[PDB]
Design a protein around this ligand. Structure first.
Ligand code: GNP
Ligand code: MG
Lengths: 56, 167
């Protein structure tokens, strides 16, 4: 933590911004997958999305 | 069985209390630590209104994003919609016209819409005057009600009204 130089916390800030960008990208990929899957579930077997879930 | 099966959708900004309105109506349950809804789901409740038994099929999804791949299927066959805002957050009310446009663009012309001001329990934090929202609803031909999923006020009345107004 406080053992790092100014230049070293700057590089770490850079590193964590890169990373957080990648995590946001991944979240969007997961969200997209979910929505695309759900379109098919909703059109084909919407009962799957019921709460509580009852299998057919 | 039932005399009628009505699909109703919940819409409105993230955080306004859609999922807790659903849980309160269908199970008389409320969760203070509820998180943004992932995916899409529905829950059912049968009720006696006007001497008829209506199976209400209530759909729910997060309101983080107005339009998604699931939006058309979400609105498809829906005959009722609860358009919900948070009385304690004026921004959620400002966005009501945007949600109304999403309806007008993707739902049936004859969908019955009920404007719902939720979190009425937060009296001390009110940011949307009742008269303001009621006037908007009137102008736009929408029924209007204030609810609290937390303390249960008007939750059944909101759903009862819209289900009634679909027949
Ligand atoms: N005080 C108060 N808090 C409420 C009320 N209804 C819901 N909340 C709280 O508001 C937060 C969001 O509720 P939630 O139902 O998850 O909102 P949502 O509209 O489903 N969110 P999302 O669209 O992102 O799924 C939660 O902490 C919940 O407990 C209410 O009537 N009063
Ligand atoms: Mg929700």
């Amino acid at each position: 933590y406080r053992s790092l130089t100014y230049e070293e916390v700057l590089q770490e800030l850079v590193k964590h911004k890169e990373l957080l960008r990648r995590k946001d990208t991944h979240i969007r990929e997961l969200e997209d997958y979910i929505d695309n899957l759900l379109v098919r579930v909703m059109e084909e077997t919407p009962s799957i999305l019921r709460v509580p879930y009852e299998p057919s | 069985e039932y005399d009628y099966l009505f699909k109703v959708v919940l819409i409105g900004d993230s955080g306004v209390g859609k999922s807790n309105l659903l849980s309160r109506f269908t199970r008389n349950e409320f969760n203070l630590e509820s998180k943004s809804t992932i995916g899409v789901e529905f829950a059912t409740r049968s009720i006696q209104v006007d001497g008829k038994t209506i199976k209400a099929q209530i759909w729910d999804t997060a309101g983080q994003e107005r339009y998604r791949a699931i939006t058309s299927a979400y609105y498809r066959g829906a005959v009722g919609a609860l358009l919900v805002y948070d009385i304690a957050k004026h921004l959620t009310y400002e966005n009501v016209e945007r949600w109304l446009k999403e309806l007008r663009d993707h739902a049936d012309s004859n969908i019955v819409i009920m404007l719902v001001g939720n979190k009425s329990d937060l009296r001390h934090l009110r940011a949307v005057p009742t008269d303001e929202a009621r006037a908007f609803a009137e102008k736009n031909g929408l029924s209007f009600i204030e609810t609290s999923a937390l303390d249960s006020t008007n939750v059944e009345a909101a759903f009862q009204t819209i289900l009634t107004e679909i027949y």
